[PDB]
Ligand SMILES: CCCOc1ccc(C(=O)NS(=O)(=O)c2ccccc2)cc1CNC(=O)c1ccc(-c2ncccn2)cc1
């Protein structure tokens with residue numbers, strides 16, 4: 001029966017590679033120094049950064065915020081495509097699929113964002129750039145505390161030393177969460193997640209035999225992700241409440 | 257197997273201490289709730305006059321109606337902190353930790369445990385109180401004057417889902433131990449020795465659920481995911497309390513609970 005769990009793990013790994021360009025293994029090689037990325041450590045390297053690498057992604061703090069928004073919008077489509085490759089997912093009630101993606105994408109965004117972070121900064125622009133933790137923290141209120149909680153999570157998350165093959169299954173487990181509000185048919189969702197869970201459990205045991213209770217430790221990080229997401233939502237609200245300089249083009253805002 | 261043997265020993269030790277620290281077990285609570293018996297029948301409180309006669313029939317160990325009920329839950333919570341603290345000390349390695357970290361684990365751990373153990377005392381219709389002598393309906397509690405009317409409801413919602421896991425006391429003893437030894441608590445000085453203990457606890461829990469619920473696929477994984485639900489409930493609860501102290505300036509909060517809420 002473990003032959004089907006290994007097949008599922010492989011299936012998911014291949015799909016994850018196809019859907020997500022910048023893998024963790026690639027990002028790690030770049031971060032550690034093993035064709036260096038442009039570094040943004042202050043206002044002037046910022047200015048030159050957009051001059052050089054030029055991101056589709058007026059005020060500096062606002063321009064950075066909006067850039068992260070553009071990337072998350074792309075990430076949602078990459079995630080959506082990955083979800084469709086998870087066995088059983090497309091066979092679910094279409095409203096439920098929509099629901100699972102709607103509530104799942106932020107958790108996955110921050111999970112995968114950790115792959116792009118170390119304690120010193122984050123890879124941006126498909127790894128063409130590196131923007132420092134301190135520079136981000138130096139953005140005026142309340143933008144200077146937007147990325148920081150994510151860095152704190154990443155550092156803890158990255159200590160688990162997961163690889164791409166591990167994360168492919170973990171991500172799929174997040175998507176198939178039966179507790180999302182408004183779901184109409186919870187049974188096949190938890191039935192699929194139960195199977196992904198077994199796959200992840202086995203994967204972690206074979207891949208990290210020396211890492212005791214890694215499975216448990218990973219599931220515990222769910223708490224952390226969700227806390228990060230609700231916290232993020234709340235900051236977004238303050239940006240909405242205050243901040244008049246956030247208004248984009250009518251059509252542009254529709255996209256977000 | 258010699259590994260497995262040490263894990264079973266740890267499970268037995270924990271279940272034993274749990275029975276010793278917590279006077280009203282889930283097993284007892286379920287016996288009262290399912291109302292099979294004639295000696296263990298609770299007096300039911302479902303409205304005001306019912307509550308009034310409750311005060312007579314029920315010996316409570318410890319003004320306005322919502323307030324007397326609030327102060328009632330506050331007393332019980334404090335009693336629970338004491339019970340949990342006593343249980344915590346029995347967990348191997350706990351008392352050997354940095355004193356400041358022992359306190360930190362308790363501070364952030366006790367509410368998650370209170371609402372875990374509170375689920376043992378609930379069904380969809382209400383909650384056992386005063387050592388199972390009383391039963392207060394969910395509707396009566398929901399009908400309370402705002403904002404007291406919605407203090408208890410999120411706990412009920414959690415409990416019915418949690419209860420569907422069908423855990424028994426021997427399972428819960430270990431799960432509660434795992435909650436206490438949480439290495440991700442804010443302000444922990446020495447994370448590693450906590451994590452090492454928690455690691456051992458997680459092994460014990462995992463084996464326990466497999467032996468006790470062999471037909472329950474991924475119960476271990478499902479139980480751990482409930483820790484997310486617990487965090488949420490505690491967060492909501494604390495926010496609710498901050499609302500109260502501003503609206504109800506004549507309402508007193510117990511100092512121990514206050515110290516727990518402080519910078520939570
Ligand atoms: C692979 C998953 C997606 O990557 C994500 C996803 C979400 C987020 C995110 O939620 N950001 S955020 O919390 O909304 C934020 C707000 C204000 C300042 C910093 C961050 C960020 C990135 C990472 N950020 C970037 O890639 C990025 C950052 C800055 C720019 C940028 N900087 C200067 C000018 C224009 N763009 C472009 C991209």
Ligand SMILES: CCCOc1ccc(C(=O)NS(=O)(=O)c2ccccc2)cc1CNC(=O)c1ccc(-c2ncccn2)cc1
Pocket residue numbers: 316322324325326327328329330332333336370373374377383384385386392397400404407408493
């Ligand atoms: C280990 C089990 C823990 O039990 C707990 C723990 C926490 C809480 C809790 O946090 N409650 S609460 O959310 O603060 C709340 C306050 C007011 C109305 C509804 C809810 C409640 C109970 C349950 N409540 C009671 O046991 C209780 C309820 C009512 C009375 C009471 N009622 C009327 C008059 C006097 N006492 C006494 C105890």
